Design a protein around this ligand. Structure first.
Ligand SMILES: CCCCCC/C=C\CCCCCCCC(=O)O
Length: 134
């Protein structure tokens, strides 16, 4: 299905509003600096039905594996532990819903002109990051 379009290694080429989004998530200033400086690689890998989103950089490494439609606890880049659900819309964009501590954030990923466009919302605070195929 549509997930195959996402598969591969992706390199950050732009980031906008990420500091404000990280602020809303509760990230400390140093870690926010790491996030602003980072230009990470993101691997979206699938084998069998299991998908992995693996985020690599000099500062921090993170990874989460899951099946589509099946909830799971995620350890996030900033050290949150969330209940996450990941789904594909008819669009079909990839939606990742995260819930923790009575809070909620939504990260969408779509392909626009061959680029992975990631849009995150937290309390109407918006951020968008774009990756290029490696
Ligand atoms: C992304 C570079 C990792 C190094 C910086 C780690 C510190 C803060 C990162 C905030 C993580 C929360 C937002 C991640 C969501 C996303 O990447 O789509």
């Amino acid at each position: 299905m549509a997930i195959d379009a996402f598969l591969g290694k992706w390199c950050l080429i732009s980031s906008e509003g990420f500091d404000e989004y990280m602020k809303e998530l509760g990230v400390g200033m140093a870690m926010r600096k790491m996030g602003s400086m980072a230009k990470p690689d993101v691997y979206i890998i699938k084998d069998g039905d299991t998908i992995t989103v693996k985020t690599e950089s000099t500062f921090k490494t993170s990874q989460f594996s899951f099946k589509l439609g099946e909830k799971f606890e995620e350890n996030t880049l900033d050290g949150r532990k969330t209940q996450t659900l990941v789904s594909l819309k008819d669009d079909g964009s990839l939606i990742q819903e995260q819930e923790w501590d009575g809070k909620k954030t939504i990260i969408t990923r779509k392909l626009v002109d061959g680029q992975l466009v990631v849009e995150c919302d937290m309390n109407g605070i918006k951020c968008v990051r774009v990756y290029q195929k490696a």
